[PDB]
Every structure is written in C-alpha cells, then in structure tokens.
A paper describes a structure:
4-Diphosphocytidyl-2C-methyl-d-erythritol kinase ([name]) catalyses the ATP-dependent conversion of 4-diphosphocytidyl-2C-methyl-d-erythritol (CDPME) to 4-diphosphocytidyl-2C-methyl-d-erythritol 2-phosphate with the release of ADP. This reaction occurs in the non-mevalonate pathway of isoprenoid precursor biosynthesis and because it is essential in important microbial pathogens and absent from mammals it represents a potential target for anti-infective drugs. The enzyme displays the characteristic α/β galacto-homoserine-mevalonate-phosphomevalonate kinase fold, with the catalytic centre positioned in a deep cleft between the ATP- and CDPME-binding domains. Gel filtration and analytical ultracentrifugation indicate that AaIspE is a monomer in solution.
Although data for complex I were measured from AaIspE co-crystallized with the relatively stable ATP analogue AMP-PNP only ADP could be modeled. The lack of electron density for the terminal phosphate groups of CDPME2P and AMP-PNP is either a result of disorder and/or hydrolysis. In complex I, [name] displays a single conformation in molecule A and three in molecule B (not shown). Such conformational freedom, distinct from the ordered substrate, may reflect loss of the methylerythritol component and the numerous stabilizing interactions that it forms deep within the enzyme active site. The cytosine moieties of the four [name] molecules interact with Tyr24, His25, Lys145 and Tyr175 with differences (not shown) confined to the orientation and binding modes of the solvent-exposed ribose and phosphate groups. One [name] conformer in molecule B is similar to that observed in molecule A. In the second conformer in molecule B the α-phosphate occupies a similar position but the β-phosphate group is directed out of the active site to interact with both Tyr24 OH and the carbonyl of Ile127. This latter interaction suggests that protonation of the phosphate has occurred. In the third conformer the α-phosphate interacts with the backbone amide of Gly172, the β-phosphate group with the Ser169 carbonyl, Thr171 amide and OG1.
Residue numbers in the entry: -1 to 268
The structure:
Amino acid sequence: SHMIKVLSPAKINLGLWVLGRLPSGYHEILTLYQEIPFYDEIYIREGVLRVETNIGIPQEENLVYKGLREFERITGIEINYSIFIQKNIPPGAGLGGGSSNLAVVLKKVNELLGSPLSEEELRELVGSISADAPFFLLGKSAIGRGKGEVLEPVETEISGKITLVIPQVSSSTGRVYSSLREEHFVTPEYAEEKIQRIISGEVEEIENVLGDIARELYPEINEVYRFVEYLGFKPFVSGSGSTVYFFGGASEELKKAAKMRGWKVVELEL
Ligand SMILES: Nc1ncnc2c1ncn2[C@@H]1O[C@H](COP(=O)(O)OP(=O)(O)O)[C@@H](O)[C@H]1O
Ligand SMILES: Nc1ccn([C@@H]2O[C@H](COP(=O)(O)OP(=O)(O)O)[C@@H](O)[C@H]2O)c(=O)n1
Ligand SMILES: [Cl-]
C-alpha cells in the first residue's frame, strides 16, 4: 500500500588499485567510482517486512534485508515495508548492484520513518554490510579509499559513450582477492597519480589488477576482453569482474556476437 518506486543505479570502477592488507584480512584500495545510468527497479510498499527479487535471491542472503534488520536492531523501530527488486544489474558483474540496492532502500526507508538516522549513521550502517554501499548515497563521481567507503566526490572531464559487455559467468570477489599476490600491490602515491590523470579525462590510464586476475580465473571474461580488443577498442574491467567496458558505441558486429554468447550489452552515455 502507498507504493513508491526508487531507481537503484550501477557503478563502474574507472581504475582500481590494491594498496595493502588490513588487520581484518580485507584489502585497502584506491578506486574511482562512477555512477552509470543502468538501474534496478525497486517497489516499496507498506506491509510485512519482506525483500523479494525477480531472480530468486534468498531473502536471508539479500543485502537489503540484512540492512533493514540491522536498521531495526539499531533504532528499535519496527520496519513495516515490503520491498520488491527487479534485478537488471546482474549479480557478480562487478557493478555493485547489491550495494546500490542496500543504499537506496535504506536512505528512503530512513526518510519515510522521519530520518531517525543521521547521514553519518546511515553511511556507517550500509558500510558495515558492504564497502561499495556508501558510494551510492552520493552517486555521480567519487574517489573511494579504505575499502571504498571513505569517499571524496570529484568532478571528471570524462564524457561520451561507454559500453558494457557483461559475460554470463558470475565473478567471485572473494576468489579474486585470494589469488592476489603481494607483488600486485601498489603505493597510494602511484595510484593517486593514475586517478588524477583519469579524472582529467585520460581514460587510457585506467587499470585494475583484480581484472587481470578475474581474466585468469574466468576464461569467459578474458574472451570478452580479447573480443573488445579485436573490435579495436581498449577494454577495461569493473570491480573484480565480470563486466568489461570500453569507451565507444556498440556495433552490429558486437551485438550479434553478444546474442550468440549471451553477453548483455549496455549502451551508456555520460
Ligand atoms: N539485492 C542484491 N542484489 C544483487 N546481489 C546481491 C543482493 N543481495 C546480496 N547479493 C549478493 O551479492 C552477489 C553479487 O554482488 P553484486 O553487488 O550484485 O555485484 P558485485 O559484487 O559483482 O559488484 C550475489 O552473488 C549475491 O549473493
Ligand atoms: N576490499 C575488499 C573487499 C573484499 N575482500 C575479500 O573478498 C571477500 C568477499 O567480498 P564481499 O564484499 O563480496 O563479501 P563479504 O565477505 O564482504 O560479505 C571478502 O570476504 C574479503 O576476503 C577484500 O579482501 N578486500
Ligand atoms: Cl581495467
């Protein structure tokens, strides 16, 4: 009852660098987050606390449910909202779809409940569940530090066409970080120079070691990477895979080869 709809956007990493290993066993990163016009559709209704999707994600596993239940635990308030998410952003595509879902729902539910959580409290809540989530409370363009949750909004000189080519294989972030050799690490200073160049519009400066690894672990990601090269474009990888992107439009040759393999092609403009 009283149905409202909210969009839940995807992100790409315009470069990612691993800086070190933290006491938790998690890795410190530098990355440039970019919100893209590619959305999940979320329906928010008054009713029993429920989180359903259209792709069969178990409610207990759902980041949105874990968020709303933690909301209840922290605030003592009973959340009486039914959530249905139409999942267009594929899980494991390195596009932070789950984190986006988490962030947008909790921000809206907070607002609906008269904002019992401050910006600091909302951000720390979503961040405790997912490091990529706080970015989606800002959107647009931001440098991500720590594990990604320490953010600095920036304005980039990047505009024009960006095309995503999404393989079928779902990339595991855990497996990718586990294959990461201590020699793949870089200094924050190196990564900072790279990011500054990318912000200025020098997209050829984008790189991502997790993509190097994803390509070694999941051959289909490598196939997509190689195919984008064959088309005469520099390919880039989002998150820990699986999505390969490039700066140019989708051609009929790409589209046809995608349909034959089941690759999702997403044509964006910034
Ligand atoms: N609402 C959600 N949407 C997508 N994935 C989710 C959600 N809740 C939990 N997950 C988990 O996150 C994994 C995929 O991560 P996702 O955030 O979609 O992209 P990535 O982590 O590759 O950037 C899934 O395998 C799934 O188990
Ligand atoms: N910044 C990060 C993010 C993830 N990881 C690793 O990747 C695993 C899976 O990441 P995830 O965010 O998809 O799942 P969680 O285990 O965080 O719930 C984590 O358990 C970490 O071991 C990391 O080392 N550093
Ligand atoms: Cl890359």
